[PDB]
Scaffold this motif. Structure first.
Motif, PDB file in Angstrom:
ATOM      1  N   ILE A  26      11.758  -2.874 -13.686  1.00 15.25           N
ATOM      2  CA  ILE A  26      11.424  -3.252 -12.776  1.00 15.25           C
ATOM      3  C   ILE A  26      10.741  -2.917 -12.713  1.00 15.25           C
ATOM      4  O   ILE A  26       9.883  -1.451 -13.694  1.00 15.25           O
ATOM      5  CB  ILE A  26      11.947  -1.842 -11.132  1.00 15.25           C
ATOM      6  N   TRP A  27       8.835  -3.071 -12.647  1.00 17.97           N
ATOM      7  CA  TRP A  27       7.668  -2.738 -12.956  1.00 17.97           C
ATOM      8  C   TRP A  27       6.627  -2.371 -11.594  1.00 17.97           C
ATOM      9  O   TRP A  27       7.119  -2.424 -10.909  1.00 17.97           O
ATOM     10  CB  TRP A  27       6.628  -3.444 -13.780  1.00 17.97           C
ATOM     11  N   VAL A  28       6.088  -1.952 -11.720  1.00 20.10           N
ATOM     12  CA  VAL A  28       4.519  -1.540 -10.606  1.00 20.10           C
ATOM     13  C   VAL A  28       3.706  -1.521 -11.883  1.00 20.10           C
ATOM     14  O   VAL A  28       3.341  -1.488 -12.576  1.00 20.10           O
ATOM     15  CB  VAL A  28       4.547   0.181 -10.832  1.00 20.10           C
ATOM     16  N   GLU A  29       2.323  -2.416 -11.355  1.00 24.90           N
ATOM     17  CA  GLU A  29       1.449  -2.348 -11.653  1.00 24.90           C
ATOM     18  C   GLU A  29       0.312  -2.451 -10.552  1.00 24.90           C
ATOM     19  O   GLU A  29       0.040  -2.252  -9.322  1.00 24.90           O
ATOM     20  CB  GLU A  29       1.680  -4.362 -11.676  1.00 24.90           C
ATOM     21  N   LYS A  30      -0.723  -2.163 -11.026  1.00 19.45           N
ATOM     22  CA  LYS A  30      -2.300  -1.543 -10.371  1.00 19.45           C
ATOM     23  C   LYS A  30      -3.492  -1.666 -11.369  1.00 19.45           C
ATOM     24  O   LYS A  30      -3.378  -1.840 -12.840  1.00 19.45           O
ATOM     25  CB  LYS A  30      -1.719  -0.276 -10.046  1.00 19.45           C
ATOM     26  N   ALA A  40      16.440  -3.741  -5.416  1.00 14.78           N
ATOM     27  CA  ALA A  40      16.111  -3.431  -5.805  1.00 14.78           C
ATOM     28  C   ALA A  40      14.052  -3.163  -5.415  1.00 14.78           C
ATOM     29  O   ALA A  40      13.815  -2.062  -4.857  1.00 14.78           O
ATOM     30  CB  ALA A  40      15.618  -3.472  -7.593  1.00 14.78           C
ATOM     31  N   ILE A  41      13.743  -3.855  -4.589  1.00 14.89           N
ATOM     32  CA  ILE A  41      12.662  -4.068  -4.049  1.00 14.89           C
ATOM     33  C   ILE A  41      12.700  -3.998  -2.921  1.00 14.89           C
ATOM     34  O   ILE A  41      11.948  -3.639  -2.259  1.00 14.89           O
ATOM     35  CB  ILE A  41      12.084  -6.004  -4.661  1.00 14.89           C
ATOM     36  N   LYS A  42      13.794  -4.150  -1.772  1.00 13.33           N
ATOM     37  CA  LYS A  42      13.829  -3.790  -0.904  1.00 13.33           C
ATOM     38  C   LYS A  42      13.926  -2.147  -0.667  1.00 13.33           C
ATOM     39  O   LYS A  42      14.160  -2.001   0.702  1.00 13.33           O
ATOM     40  CB  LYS A  42      15.003  -4.345  -0.499  1.00 13.33           C
ATOM     41  N   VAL A  69      -2.854   0.341  -3.609  1.00  9.70           N
ATOM     42  CA  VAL A  69      -2.217  -0.715  -3.760  1.00  9.70           C
ATOM     43  C   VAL A  69      -1.492  -1.149  -5.117  1.00  9.70           C
ATOM     44  O   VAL A  69      -2.485  -1.261  -5.661  1.00  9.70           O
ATOM     45  CB  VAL A  69      -2.922  -2.109  -2.860  1.00  9.70           C
ATOM     46  N   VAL A  70       0.155  -1.402  -4.583  1.00  5.47           N
ATOM     47  CA  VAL A  70       0.168  -1.339  -6.253  1.00  5.47           C
ATOM     48  C   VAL A  70       1.429  -2.933  -5.983  1.00  5.47           C
ATOM     49  O   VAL A  70       2.017  -3.315  -5.197  1.00  5.47           O
ATOM     50  CB  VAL A  70       1.130  -0.502  -6.427  1.00  5.47           C
ATOM     51  N   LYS A  71       2.254  -3.237  -7.113  1.00  5.45           N
ATOM     52  CA  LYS A  71       2.803  -4.867  -7.259  1.00  5.45           C
ATOM     53  C   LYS A  71       3.863  -4.508  -7.713  1.00  5.45           C
ATOM     54  O   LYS A  71       3.465  -3.782  -8.834  1.00  5.45           O
ATOM     55  CB  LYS A  71       1.813  -5.852  -7.646  1.00  5.45           C
ATOM     56  N   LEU A  72       4.778  -4.611  -6.741  1.00  2.00           N
ATOM     57  CA  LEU A  72       6.071  -4.338  -7.414  1.00  2.00           C
ATOM     58  C   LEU A  72       6.904  -5.865  -7.982  1.00  2.00           C
ATOM     59  O   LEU A  72       6.364  -6.071  -7.269  1.00  2.00           O
ATOM     60  CB  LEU A  72       7.074  -3.707  -6.301  1.00  2.00           C
ATOM     61  N   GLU A 121       0.670  -0.885  -0.283  1.00  2.84           N
ATOM     62  CA  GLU A 121       0.208   0.144   0.070  1.00  2.84           C
ATOM     63  C   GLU A 121       1.054   1.441  -0.079  1.00  2.84           C
ATOM     64  O   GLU A 121       2.170   1.334   0.575  1.00  2.84           O
ATOM     65  CB  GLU A 121      -0.799  -0.172   1.464  1.00  2.84           C
ATOM     66  N   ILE A 122       0.581   1.762  -0.663  1.00  2.00           N
ATOM     67  CA  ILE A 122       1.428   3.668  -0.926  1.00  2.00           C
ATOM     68  C   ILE A 122       0.541   4.688   0.616  1.00  2.00           C
ATOM     69  O   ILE A 122      -0.692   4.810  -0.042  1.00  2.00           O
ATOM     70  CB  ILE A 122       1.727   4.469  -2.332  1.00  2.00           C
TER      71      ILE A 122
END
Length: 88
Positions: free
Chosen positions: A33-37, A73-75, A60-63, A7-8
């Motif tokens: 790296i991708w962001v999905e919503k 990167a994700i961390k 809420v997004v999926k990284l 969640e942002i």
């Protein structure tokens, strides 16, 4: 590949200075790296991509990241988001 859902929570979501901090942080990494919503996937390193996603507070997004530094990167992005981009 490493993926996380998160969640942002900061006031502007992925807009304004947080959007810049997000893209700059993602850009430090060699991984893709991708962001999905909502069935829309964009390049986390792209300011136009991030804006097109329209991520507001509470969304809420999926990284996801794929590459040699994908865990790191994700961390980094998770840590940045969990600090609310430095905002109280």
């Amino acid at each position: 590949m490493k993926e996380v859902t998160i969640e942002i929570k900061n006031k502007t979501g992925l807009h304004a200075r947080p959007a810049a901090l997000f893209v700059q942080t993602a850009s430090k990494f060699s991984s893709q790296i991708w962001v999905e919503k909502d069935n829309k996937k964009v390049n986390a390193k792209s300011i136009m991509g991030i804006m097109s996603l329209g991520v507001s507070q509470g969304n809420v997004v999926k990284l996801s990241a794929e590459g040699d530094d994908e865990e790191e990167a994700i961390k980094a992005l998770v840590d940045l988001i969990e600090s609310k981009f430095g905002e109280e």
